[PDB]
Every structure is written in C-alpha cells, then in structure tokens.
Amino acid sequence: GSSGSSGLAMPPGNSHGLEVGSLAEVKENPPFYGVIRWIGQPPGLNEVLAGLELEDECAGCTDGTFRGTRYFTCALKKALFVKLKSCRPDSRFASLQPSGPSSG
C-alpha cells in the first residue's frame, strides 16, 4: 500500500479512477476537457472507449454517437470518444474539505 492520505487507488485496474460521471482528460494535440459518459467496447473492436463530452462546441465531433450507436444523450458537436486506458483523471472540479475545522 502506498504511503499517503487519500486511497481508492487501483492502478492495475484502469489507471487511477476513470468512470462515468467523473471528469477526465485526453493526451492529444488539441488540449480540451470533457467528462466521461459511456465506457464500453463496440461490437467489433475490443477497447474500453470512454465517451468524453467536450465543454466547448468544436466542429468535427458528434452528438454522442460512436459507430452509429448512441450510448448517451449530449449536445451537438460536444462528444468525443477516446480510449479509457489513455485517459487521465481530471481534478479541475475536485474539492477536498471545503473548510478546515470539521468539528461543529
């Protein structure tokens, strides 16, 4: 076990903690940010693809449809699918103890 304070780490699993609902980041040329939506493998190519919904409307993306198979419901031009294995936890909106003194 790693020597720290925060646990819930499963490197042997996916990478750290990338699941539906949680924010993640993809390592590519265009630096963008999106939250996970659907995580699965289409009928043909076995690969954990986590559907990320881009906050910014970029021309070229889809409305949450991979290979003509809608997994979730999102806006138009704000759904980019990527390999979950090549994803990174996004702590852009991660909070830890809003206040110091917890003892009321």
Side-chain angles (χ1 to χ4, degrees):
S2 270
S3 41
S5 214
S6 215
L8 316 146
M10 297 207 56
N14 300 280
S15 269
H16 268 287
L18 302 150
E19 49 245 319
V20 186
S22 274
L23 293 151
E25 188 191 332
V26 188
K27 223 68 63 267
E28 226 193 279
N29 263 258
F32 49 68
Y33 282 127
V35 61
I36 309 180
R37 312 299 278 185
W38 170 90
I39 310 168
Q41 311 140 285
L45 48 159
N46 205 253
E47 39 195 78
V48 189
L49 297 150
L52 290 169
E53 182 215 67
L54 309 155
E55 305 209 323
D56 217 58
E57 270 220 34
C58 214
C61 307
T62 53
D63 51 85
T65 47
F66 199 75
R67 308 258 170 164
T69 309
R70 181 220 242 172
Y71 291 120
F72 51 97
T73 325
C74 270
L76 280 148
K77 302 278 162 143
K78 301 182 99 212
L80 177 76
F81 289 84
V82 292
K83 303 173 142 143
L84 177 83
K85 62 198 166 189
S86 304
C87 281
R88 265 266 161 199
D90 207 63
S91 210
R92 270 201 68 77
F93 287 61
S95 185
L96 254 58
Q97 309 286 287
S99 269
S102 54
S103 217

